[PDB]
Amino acid sequence: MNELVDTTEMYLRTIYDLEEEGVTPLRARIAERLDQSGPTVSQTVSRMERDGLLRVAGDRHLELTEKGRALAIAVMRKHRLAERLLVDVIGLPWEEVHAEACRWEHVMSEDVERRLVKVLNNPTTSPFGNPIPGLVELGV
Ligand SMILES: [Zn+2]
Ligand SMILES: [Zn+2]
């Protein structure tokens, strides 16, 4: 746990970020970013390779497989959906929201999200400008 309440989803997510930052998904990054040691991140990656979420191409840079980009895009939609909820509705301070949504993202349901895509006034960008991926594939 530890706010990284779901490693599998965190790894996948962090790559969505590295790609969104316009940077290279180097294991050095995911290890530092998540406070995991290299020997374990590769342990996790190989594991996630054996699960069909990622693929280690020539670049050696971990790549999101259709399943990985799938379980990555949704967690980012949940993440961002909660960010709106916390700011717009709950009113948590704008700077505390991220670390909050960073957790709730692993526990929010598609059923809840839809209610949010509805109840919430603007499900286009999360508070920090970021786009809300998956909307179409959510069912809204
Ligand atoms: Zn955030
Ligand atoms: Zn998280």
UniProtKB/Swiss-Prot annotation:
Main location as per UniProt: cytoplasm
Domain HTH dtxR-type: 4-65
Compartments it resides in: Cytoplasm
An MF annotation (GO) of this entry: DNA-binding transcription factor activity
Biological process, per Gene Ontology: negative regulation of DNA-templated transcription
Family, similarity comment: Belongs to the DtxR/MntR family.
Subunit field text: Homodimer.
Protein name: Iron-dependent repressor IdeR
Part of the full-length chain shown: 1 to 140 of 230
